[PDB]
């Protein structure tokens, strides 16, 4: 039973996913709008005095297959080393965008070591922001042109993660069975295609 639900950020009452609203996403398959993961959502918002989210409640998103707008992850549980709760996300549409043109934005997650967007096949519009993820690997080889269905140029803001040479040296590279399109993480179930 496909179930569409409203998201956060722009055009929405909710500015971030938080404990107050996380359970509204139970069994959603399609997000009408955006998902935002702000620091206040994950650790607690003093001005509304909203509690810190329960990290195991992020498993609600395993039902998400489509995000109409953008994905904006700026805080993540320190012991969750990838975004495997979005293993079933296939399409980011970017009908609505975040900041200066982004549909995907992964920022300053000191503890994420791979992305894990295993099902991700299409980002229909927008620019890609992946920066300051000091531990992030496996994204270096990834063929964004496949996912963006267009020229990669003027669409990437991918900086300041773990240095490629450092990833290569520690064996944090794509499995040999994966295409030259790359991986979302270690091993053969993580190949882009």
């Amino acid at each position, epitope marked *: 039973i496909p179930k569409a639900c409203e998201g956060t950020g*722009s*055009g929405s009452r909710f500015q971030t996913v938080d404990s107050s609203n996380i359970d509204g996403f139970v069994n959603c398959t399609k997000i009408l709008g955006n998902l*935002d993961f702000l620091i206040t959502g994950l650790n607690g918002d003093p001005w509304h005095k909203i509690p810190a989210l329960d990290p195991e409640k992020l498993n609600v998103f395993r039902t998400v297959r489509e995000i109409t707008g953008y994905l904006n992850i700026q805080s993540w549980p320190p012991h969750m080393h990838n975004f495997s709760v979005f293993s079933n996300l296939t399409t980011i549409g970017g009908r609505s*965008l975040y900041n200066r043109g982004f549909s995907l934005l992964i920022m300053k997650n000191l503890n994420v070591t791979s992305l894990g967007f295993r099902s991700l096949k299409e980002i229909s519009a927008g620019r890609i922001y992946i920066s300051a993820n000091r531990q992030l690997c496996y994204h270096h080889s990834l063929n964004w042109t496949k996912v963006l269905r267009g020229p990669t140029e003027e669409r990437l*803001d991918i900086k300041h993660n773990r240095p490629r040479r450092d990833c290569v040296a520690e064996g944090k590279v794509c499995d040999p069975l994966c295409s030259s399109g790359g991986c979302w993480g270690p091993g053969p179930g993580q190949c882009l295609s």
Partner: antibody
Amino acid sequence: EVQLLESGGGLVQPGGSLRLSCAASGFTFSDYDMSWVRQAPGKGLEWVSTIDLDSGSIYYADSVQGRFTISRDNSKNTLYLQMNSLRAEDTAVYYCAKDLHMGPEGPFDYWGQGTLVTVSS
Amino acid sequence: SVLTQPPSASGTPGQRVTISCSGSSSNIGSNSVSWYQQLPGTAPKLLIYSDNHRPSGVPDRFSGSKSGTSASLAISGLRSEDEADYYCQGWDTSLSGHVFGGGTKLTVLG
């Protein structure tokens, strides 16, 4: 409390050059994308340029492209606009603007009082 | 910088005024709208960002909404002190730059 002070405006001859300065205080300068927005006397707002927190992405308006250079010095809490090949229609108050990098609240969550640039023979 | 706004809007104290802002898919159809208040002689201040959210310190009589490529700013409970120029703004994917509206002069009567 936050504060943006612009400076360096004045009268200058067409084809001439000036350098505007924005001195920042009351926030971590390094966390903020800085921008320049201008306003001709009695006319609307016109975005000029944006640089990001680390000088990693830089954006310009078609109207100034190839004549103005934005820059920043995080260690000095100072934004810069090097303006070359000035045209009379660049006459404007130049505002300095700030917004947290990839924050939700923006763009231009705070503006200074502006410096006035007059371009005339 | 071609976002279409009404040049002028008016109201009496305690009214609700709306200011519209028309754009394109590449600007406010995709990216978010922000709105600014500029009182005469003074620097603009952000009013509304990401289509409908208000900075803390911005009263909730100001509200923003968007659908397609048209955005609306609302000022309920109009005040003398709200007499000002209002600018909408949007990032434009096509331009890699910000695009402002012309401005609307809001006058408070009564």
